[PDB]
Design a protein around this ligand. Structure first.
Ligand code: 3AB
Length: 353
């Protein structure tokens, strides 16, 4: 296979495995069935952006009911209509109400994945009579360079240390093994990026395996405009952690599906507005500042920071921040314009449960 790759001068084998993995539509099917989405009643191949937008609109109606204190018939009506637009498989049981921030957030995550799956299914379409290998066709449509890095390189070592040293103490249900590492160069990001802003940090972002084709092809995006604001602890920005496992939790890997990806991005934080508890309306509080920082109780300290190509890497271990209702365990950072983000590394990670 290695020799066969050299003679044909095909795409690098590691990149081939990465593309095959993220473009696997059968895995998207299984992932959505796991989230209770009824793929039999509404196949993913027929999913449209208008259907998904309608879904968000019904979630907003649910949010309105919750806000006005309608927890009986009107809420069960509004939940049923969401469920008509975004069919679920609850088998024989009463379709459950959506009543809490958590439950609303779960539905938003379902619709976010469906949005990325709609993107993926279009992107993966091939020209049957084309001489190009299907993987090359997929890769080109990403408009995003992915280059494997040498495991004996300094970059690989620092990123491995970042991964391990910021694995949080409260996320002890797994450890992570870095299987491979790719440099990311998304078309347009280098030119768009807010290089002028200070406090540029290399930060984590995790997502479900179904979402990477969307993320790489469109960049990290803020939430859909029709999505319920209450779905977002600090409003409709792009969320990042300085603790690898806080983000890795959003991979939703498991003992059954133990391979996930983690993204590192340069984030132009500028001046952070620091907040101690949830506020979905945080974006309106910036008043000229460039980012929101949710303050955690535990965080990497500046003593241990290194610089990698002009961005700060907040190496662990985490320690008490002196910061303290309920309070975040770990920091989170939100920027509200994609031009404050430049994706830089994609980690292929094995989760050990
Ligand atoms: N998706 C992520 O990696 C992440 C990072 C910080 C906060 C949240 N909610 C998510």
């Amino acid at each position: 296979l290695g020799t066969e790759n050299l003679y044909f001068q095909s795409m690098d084998l590691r990149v081939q495995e990465l593309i095959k993995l993220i473009c696997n539509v059968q895995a998207m099917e299984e992932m959505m069935m796991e989230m209770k989405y009824n793929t039999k009643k509404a196949p993913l191949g027929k999913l449209t952006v208008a259907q998904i937008k309608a879904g968000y609109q019904s979630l907003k109606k649910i949010e309105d009911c919750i806000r006005a204190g309608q927890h009986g018939r009107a809420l069960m009506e509004a939940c049923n209509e969401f469920y008509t637009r975004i069919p679920h498989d609850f088998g024989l049981r009463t379709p459950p109400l959506i009543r809490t921030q958590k439950e609303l957030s779960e539905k938003i995550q379902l619709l976010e994945a469906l949005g990325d799956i709609e993107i993926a299914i279009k992107l993966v379409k091939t020209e049957l009579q084309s001489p190009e290998h299907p993987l090359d066709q997929h890769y080109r449509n990403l408009h995003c360079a992915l280059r494997p890095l040498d495991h004996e390189s300094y970059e690989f070592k620092v990123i491995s240390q970042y991964l391990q040293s910021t694995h949080a103490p409260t996320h002890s249900d797994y450890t992570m093994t870095l299987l491979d590492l790719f440099e990311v160069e998304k078309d347009g990001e280098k030119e768009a990026f807010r290089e002028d802003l200070h406090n540029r940090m290399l930060l984590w972002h995790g997502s479900r395996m179904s979402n990477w084709v969307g993320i790489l092809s469109h960049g990290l995006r803020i939430a859909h405009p029709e999505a319920p604001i209450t779905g977002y602890m600090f409003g409709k920005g792009i969320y990042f952690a300085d603790m690898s496992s806080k983000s890795a939790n959003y991979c939703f890997a498991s003992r059954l599906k133990n391979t996930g990806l983690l993204l590192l991005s340069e984030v132009a934080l500028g001046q952070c507005n620091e907040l101690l508890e949830a506020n979905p309306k945080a974006e309106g509080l910036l008043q000229g500042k460039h980012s929101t920082k949710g303050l955690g109780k535990m965080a990497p300290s500046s003593a241990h920071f290194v610089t990698l190509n002009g961005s700060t890497v907040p190496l662990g271990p985490a320690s008490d921040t002196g910061i303290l209702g309920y309070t975040l365990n770990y920091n989170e950072y939100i920027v509200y314009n994609p031009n404050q983000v430049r994706m830089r590394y994609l980690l292929k990670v094995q989760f050990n449960f």
